[PDB]
Amino acid sequence: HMKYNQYAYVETDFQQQVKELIDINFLPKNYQVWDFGSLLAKLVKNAIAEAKTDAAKNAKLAEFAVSDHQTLADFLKEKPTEIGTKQFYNVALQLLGYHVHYDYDFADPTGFMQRNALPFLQDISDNQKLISAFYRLLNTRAKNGQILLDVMAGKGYFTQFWGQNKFKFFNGKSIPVFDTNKVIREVVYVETDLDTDHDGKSDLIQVTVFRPEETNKGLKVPALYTASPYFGGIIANEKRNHNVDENLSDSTEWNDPQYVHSPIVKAEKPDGSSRPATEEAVHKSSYPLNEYMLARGFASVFAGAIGTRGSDGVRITGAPEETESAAAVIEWLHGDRVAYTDRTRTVRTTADWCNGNIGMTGRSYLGTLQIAIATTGVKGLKTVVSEAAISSWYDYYREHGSVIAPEACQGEDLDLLAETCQSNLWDAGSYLKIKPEYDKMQKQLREKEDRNTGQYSDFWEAGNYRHHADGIKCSWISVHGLNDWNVKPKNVYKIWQLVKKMPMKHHLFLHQGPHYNMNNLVSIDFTDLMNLWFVHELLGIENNAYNQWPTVMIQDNLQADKWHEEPDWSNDLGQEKIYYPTDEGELFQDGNGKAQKSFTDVGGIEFKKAGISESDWQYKFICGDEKWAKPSLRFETDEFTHPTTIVGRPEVKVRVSASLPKGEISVALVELGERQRLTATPKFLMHGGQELGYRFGTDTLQEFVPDKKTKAKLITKAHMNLQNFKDMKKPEAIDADKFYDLDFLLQPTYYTIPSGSKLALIIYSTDQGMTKRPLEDETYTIDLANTEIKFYEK
Amino acid sequence: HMKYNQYAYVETDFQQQVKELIDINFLPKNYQVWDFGSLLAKLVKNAIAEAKTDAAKNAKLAEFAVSDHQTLADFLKEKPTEIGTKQFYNVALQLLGYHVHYDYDFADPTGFMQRNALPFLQDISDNQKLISAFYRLLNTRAKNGQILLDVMAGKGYFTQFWGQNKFKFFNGKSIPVFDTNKVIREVVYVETDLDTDHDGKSDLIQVTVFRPEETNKGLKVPALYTASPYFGGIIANEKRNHNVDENLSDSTEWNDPQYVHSPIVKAEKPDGSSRPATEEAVHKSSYPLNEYMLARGFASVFAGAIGTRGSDGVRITGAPEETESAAAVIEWLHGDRVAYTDRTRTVRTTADWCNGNIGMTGRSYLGTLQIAIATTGVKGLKTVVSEAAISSWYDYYREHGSVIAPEACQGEDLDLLAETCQSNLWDAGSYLKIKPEYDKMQKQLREKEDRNTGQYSDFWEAGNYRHHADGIKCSWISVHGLNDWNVKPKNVYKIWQLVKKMPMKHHLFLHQGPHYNMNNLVSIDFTDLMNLWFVHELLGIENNAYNQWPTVMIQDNLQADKWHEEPDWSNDLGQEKIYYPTDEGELFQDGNGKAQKSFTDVGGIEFKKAGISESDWQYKFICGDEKWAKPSLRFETDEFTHPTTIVGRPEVKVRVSASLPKGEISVALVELGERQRLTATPKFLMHGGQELGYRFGTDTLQEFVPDKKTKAKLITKAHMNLQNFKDMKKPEAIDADKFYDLDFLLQPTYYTIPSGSKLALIIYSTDQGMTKRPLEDETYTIDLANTEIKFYEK
Ligand SMILES: [Ca+2]
Ligand SMILES: [Ca+2]
């Protein structure tokens, strides 16, 4: 049993139900003259889209059952005038892909449905109720995660409408009435206003367009644009990641690198003419959601922008030029910027197939650039679905004055990520020209990123999208995994605090995954919600999308099929609590420790000697392995007697002294207890079990499940440079053996500690997987009488 | 660097090269009047299939390079009359998907190609040599594993031929000139001669047909038939696996269960008429090879047979009825047996689209049924590619009188596997009728499989295909993973010894995988070999397939891109060696131990107490973890001073006494040493990086790579029941504390122990992952003076 929760079902009255059923050729136009048996047989047989003649459909009826002693065929032969509730759903559950005995009992089909959160109609005693039961059924999530109508679509139900060259809606959502055999996958070259490769010419960027062939027949469609720096190819460079096994250095060496923009060379203007594209796409959609929506009439557009394959320029990680080159594609889609058929710039081509409404899609670098482009208020951008996104690039490689890696990306920085996406180097003819420009940018990025001091700067400030949040004009969806330690959740939290204040409509989805999607889960119909959303925002159809579901949806960390509905994500969801350490290694609301406890950090010496992995170190560390926990102070609460939900950003105050005139402190909150927590990533339940359309590719149904027992889980943590004790934006010299007050915030969370578990505050320094790993020892002393951890709880 | 070894390239003379290039519209019909520059530009531009106009192709030429200082476009502008070798392959390597600097240097492109086993022409000094260099290039394996021509195919190169309704060959292989947008995926119902569900009627079996639409225009095509008991759905029943935590029992309780065949009800005969199918397929191809060949004109046919969804009957695991129902599909394909459009049996439909030549495909249960069907000599079956196959069902759940599981399938048996594939239960209307018949078969299988005694029987003998090997008339390819501990390699070895003797053509492929495919590897062009093979065997085209590559190809366990070419797989590949234990725990060709060493087997008591996994136990066991190695005797050789390759089936003799009047002995050979062995499964290198055709789905390029260091690897092992000391087919009572001589064979292998490693013989009893796990202790005493291990080495 798992709850296939459904939030995207729009309440529909019977007249509108009838209208939609007739429109999709499911219900006869004159349904009122049809008797009950004739109706029920036709509606079941129409759902059985794999049988193509009426004879074939009829033979299929023997394979369904209304009870443990009667097939559907034999039921129909009795000339029935109604159908009991259990009888109908003994048929329905099979249409939904459930199996009798193994999933449900003949005796209790609606009991089963109730426990998988599937709706059912209690009363089906006439033609009207039977039609409404079948309308709800078509809108019912099947075992493979998709509503029954999409299973019918996978069986080709909607190919009968192909060639009608128009959108068609069902329960407010676009359905697959487009000839996906004829879908157009072409390539153009948009002209930016940039000259990042210093050749005196506007940088052209290769742009991949997937559009329904129906656009060749006058239908204008919206576009879902994905700004993907990876789209042209990904250069592996992990061996070039900067060494992190180095001692800390004096941050007062900071001299505040400055941001300087690239040369501008303004592009020509569009002149009205257009010739069709002359190149077919070779790169594929990187998110099944886009292909799903493409089968349903929405074009998808993909571009790497400057520095990527078949494009001019260099990557400049996080810079305004990455925003501008990426936004240039929307300007072309809205008909304001020029594009060409090839890189000779001789023949202009337009996005005249586009209805002028653009939304964005994609995660990570792709969701990062949606935040960036949104702040420019570019005309045409109506909505973003920003997934797993960086909202400020300092927050991806730094924190509180210190150099802090993404998980499994030790030593990565702006210069590494620039090369990673510098895929025009793969064109060896362009390599001759681009290689020197790429080298110059490598030197500038390596210098300005300032790994020596870890400090913020005017340079880093250029990559802080949150300081232009006032520019956002589009509606807003953010998606983020609560356990994403790659793009850490601080990014989405801090942009949400700004965006939630703004007049446009906004939602937030937080799932239990790490750097990972949530479009194909058992527990939430995210794809159907986005369908409803994109139809409202990009087709201007009034389908209740602005009233359909809650602002914030937060997947529960104890039950994967529980989704919390909240008005916000902020400390304001809970109430303030403060825990104080004790001299006995405890953590209590009335704690009153007074000792000065010390720990000797041994940098990366012992970690690199032991040869263990970074994730092995982290787990043994938070579990309190003696060998790895020795460089730390641990404070445990007593076992919780009721579950408690920590919400928002915990804030630590800590008075500390260091043996050297420099250093860093890390602070973590850990849940203690041996139990089966959720799997790190969703478990695959039906591999390629979802149809994106008719013969249009698949996705995999999955969901988090109880894992092998673990003894602990990291809730949240953060790091801080000692020399920033006074100012997050300005370092200061410090004396060894003098106490300083650090006050800083941890990563945002939404985490239910279950009863019977303990909460551990850990104070330490070197994080083998995310800080620098010094080659020297350093002793820290913490004044327990001036240390505390404060967080909000619900 | 990895060797993309190529065995499928057929030597072609220049006249035949020219003929094929013209035929695929790559070379102009009057190529002799074209000057060098005009030729080279056209041939490069034709390879660039993603650009669709000549203008677009021309602009692409600037993106390639002939040297570190000249693009291809600028080279062409110099009016060249030849091209140097390094200049050509600086272009070619980019067409092959390699990247300059990151993969190869401008200075040494053919050096790079040499080290990836890519061919290159040393001399390109005129139009003739340039055409031959381009012919070889089109036939050159690209970085994604596919020959360049298939990359062009992915780019739609061959859609220009769609609608010509005929096969087209290139280098002896079928190429994708079929309209895969119009491919036909339909369903019929073949009528068997069986009544396994006791309803008085022939069992019908649902059959899924994928055929090129070109068959509607009179083209007859061959069929690749996959007998898949899973095709209708897979019922999970792992929790029902029989308990293996039980004490051994007296095998003389054996009373020799007998095999009895199901009722026969002969099917009607075909009468000439045929109407087209009325049902579309809902299940997908389960092997990318089939879809690849389907884009190239070969229909693929899939059927679960009796007991599966939309079919009558019950599964009877391994029985003749599973062979007969599966063979019924070939008889329909050859036009000898009837089929209907639906299960009313009212309308006949034929396989008149089929040219009468059938081959089989698929692994595991699917490759098992190919061996079974082959022994019947069914008319139409021309060749099998039998992968990961059982050749005798006793050898899947038993060995030497003992109950021996497949890896991770403890407690599985015939009755479990029957239910697993009993997918017509998913049709709840048929469940009413089938459930009682399934229950009766469960009782009969559970009883006759005789898990109590572990013995062979007349019943088991019914599932021994090797005793009907004389019936095989088809040519033969076997594929098996040397590390498959699910379908253990004994199965393929023993059928190979019979098949290799027969007059028809035969090959064998042994890879380093476990229960896993090898159609998409870096190191071998298996897919292209099968293309050449299927064209020779099913289209009757003389394309050198019978002379193209060696009989046996064996992937090396030390270098994943080394494939051994051998005439056989047998002890005859090496020379006999015998090692004898010592009283000091050593193993030497001149060993001379004389003690009686004992070990106390503690069944599953300690294993189940420790809660560790079965694979954890196995690794710690073969490494010699004190806690788990105590119930065993270990004998180590000294380190090897030269690599040695063990070949064939090692044979152990061992004199043993047991503390109880029953028992079992296990014997393993283990390679000792801490080093990076190959990954358990291939590492994904280009996820979905292979195109099956044009817009026709993908496969993933992969290859075994060095893994994290391990301290040991299992080479081979086997088990034996003490009471079978006299007869493998007949148990005997035994006295406790009396010595018996066991003489038996281990699993077949082909394993190079590297110099510096040791060879360990382990004698033990309870294998926590594959034998019964007794609840009592039992002490074994081994007479070292009458114990030895003999194997052949090369
Ligand atoms: Ca430029
Ligand atoms: Ca029957």
**How far is residue A119's CA from residue A141's CA, in Å, rounded to a whole number?**
9
Residue B128 tokens read as 């003739």
The residue from A684, A711, A738 where one domain ends is A711
In a domain, B34, yes or no: yes
- Among residues B730, B603, B722, the alpha carbon closest in space to that of B654 is found at B722
Do both B742 and B625 map to the same domain?
A: yes
Residues A157 and A211 in one domain: no
Mutate to test the interface with B, among A152, A344, A432 (most CBs of B within 10 A): A432
Residues A413 and A300 in one domain: no
Is the CB of B425 less than 8 angstroms away from the CB of A100? yes
Let me know whether A337 and A266 are in one domain. yes
**E strand or H helix at B720, and its extent?**
strand B710-721
Find the CB nearest B63 among A106, A187, A427.
Answer: A427
Which residue is catalytic, options B334, B480, B515, B536? B515
Q: Which residues pair with B481 in a beta bridge?
A: B511
Which residues have a beta carbon within 5 Å of ligand 2, which is an ion?
Answer: B 195, 197, 199, 201, 203, 312
Question: In whole angstroms, how large is the CA radius of gyration of chain B?
Answer: 29
- Single out the residue of A287, A271, A160 nearest to residue A230, CA to CA: A287
- Chain A nearest-CA distance from B204, in A, is 13
> Could you give the residue numbers annotated as active site of A?
364, 484, 515
Residue B39 C-alpha from the chain's centroid = 43
B95: nearest CA partner in chain A:
A427
Residue A83 lies in domain: 13-182
**Residue A342: which of B55, B73, B281 has the nearest Cβ?**
B55
State both tokens at B713: 């690897």
Q: Are residues B731 and B780 in the same domain?
A: yes
Domain boundary among B413, B435, B463: B463
How far is CA A26 from each of CA A77, A97, A124, A433, A786, rounded to the nearest angstrom?
22, 20, 18, 60, 71
Looking up residue B677, the CATH number of its domain turns out to be: 3.40.50.1820
Q: Are residues B441 and B510 in the same domain?
A: no
Contact at 8 Å (CB) between A690 and A146?
yes
Q: Are residues B688 and B597 in the same domain?
A: no
Between chains, do B427 and A280 touch, taking CB under 8 Å as contact? no
Is residue A476 assigned to a domain? yes
Within a domain: A665? yes
CA angle B134, B138, B140 (to 5 degrees): 110
In angstroms, the separation between the Cα of residue A72 and the nearest Cα of chain B is 7
Last residue of a domain, one of A659, A689, A711: A711
The answer to whether B65 contacts A429, with C-beta atoms less than 8 Å apart, is yes
**Is residue A718 a part of any domain in this protein?**
yes
Experimental method: X-ray
Q: Give a three-class secondary structure readout of B575-586.
A: EEEEEEECCCCE
CATH at residue B422: 1.10.246.70
Q: Are residues B472 and B370 in the same domain?
A: yes
Please tell me which of the candidates B53, B72, B428 has its beta carbon nearest to residue A94: B428
CB proximity list for A389: less than 8 A, separation 6 or greater = A363, A364, A367, A368, A370, A371, A478, A480, A487, A491, A492, A495
| A73 → chain B, closest CA residue | B429
CA separation for the pair B663, B9 (Å, rounded) = 55
Interface contact flag, A426 B68, Cβ < 8 Å? no
Residue written as tokens 């949104």?
A374
Residue B772 lies in a domain: yes
Q: For residue A433, which of A200, A681, A134, A731 has the smallest C-alpha distance?
A: A200
Question: CA–CA separation, A30 vs A791, rounded Å?
Answer: 63
Write down the number of H helices and E strands in chain A: 20, 30
Distance CA A242, CA A233 (A): 22
Token couple for B105: 């240097």
Q: How far is the CA of A236 from the centre of ligand 1 (A)?
A: 25
| Token digits of residue A367 | 């969701």
Q: Is A735 helix (H, G, I), strand (E, B) or coil?
A: coil
The reply to whether residue B342 touches residue A64, judged by beta carbons under 8 angstroms, is no
Q: Are residues B648 and B695 in the same domain?
A: no
Structural tokens at position B515: 């229960």
Question: CB-CB: which of B65, B235, B430 is closest to A102?
Answer: B235
Tell me whether residue B325 is one of the annotated catalytic residues: no
Encoded tokens for A542: 């009034």
Separation in Å, CA of B343 to nearest CA in chain A: 6
Interface probe, candidates B60, B63, B108, chain A, greatest A C-beta count within 10 A: B63
- Report how far apart the first and last C-alpha atoms of chain B are (Å, whole number): 28
Query: Which tokens in the block code for residue B5?
Result: 């070894």
Q: DSSP 3-state assignment of B128?
A: helix
In a domain, B8, yes or no: no
| Residue B515 bears catalytic tag | yes
Q: Are the beta carbons of B64 and A427 separated by less than 8 Å?
A: yes
Q: Rounded distance, CA B780 to CA B403, Å?
A: 19
Angle of helix A127-138 versus helix A36-47 axis, rounded to 10: 10
Resolution in A: 2.0
The catalytically annotated residue of B195, B395, B484, B556 is B484
Which of B44, B69, B71, B694 is the mutation pick for testing A, counting most A CBs within 10 A? B71
The span from the first CA to the last CA of chain A, in angstroms, equals 28
Domain count, chain B: 4
The candidate with the shortest Cα–Cα distance to A719, out of A763, A679, A657, is A763
Q: Which residues contact residue B561 at a Cβ distance below 8 angstroms, ignoring those fewer than 6 apart?
A: B2, B3, B5, B117, B522, B523, B703
DSSP state, A262?
Answer: P
Looking at the structure, tell me whether residues B540 and B608 fall in a common domain.
no
- Contact between B428 and A106 using a beta-carbon 8 Å cutoff: yes
Cβ-in-10-Å burial (0-12, 13-18, 19+) of B212 comes to buried
Cβ contacts of B286 on chain A, cutoff 8 Å:
none
Interface A-B, measured as beta-carbon pairs within 8 A, has a size of 146
Assess if residue B3 is contained within a domain.
Answer: no
**Contact between A476 and A383 (Cβ < 8 Å):** yes
List, in order, residues 6 or more apart from A564 with CB less than 8 Å away: A552, A553, A554, A555, A556, A750
Q: Are A334 and A379 in contact (CB under 8 A)?
A: yes
CA dist., res. A446 & res. A452, Å (int):
10
CB contact under 8 A, A53 and B278: yes
Tell me: do A274 and A302 sit in the same domain.
Answer: yes
Does residue A524 lie in a domain region? Answer: yes
Q: How far is CA A413 from the centre of its chain?
A: 22
Question: Is the CB of residue A544 less than 8 Å from the CB of residue A172?
Answer: yes
Residue with tokens 């599909």: B329
Q: Are residues A559 and A509 in the same domain?
A: yes
Give the C-alpha separation, B300 to B215, whole Å.
Answer: 13
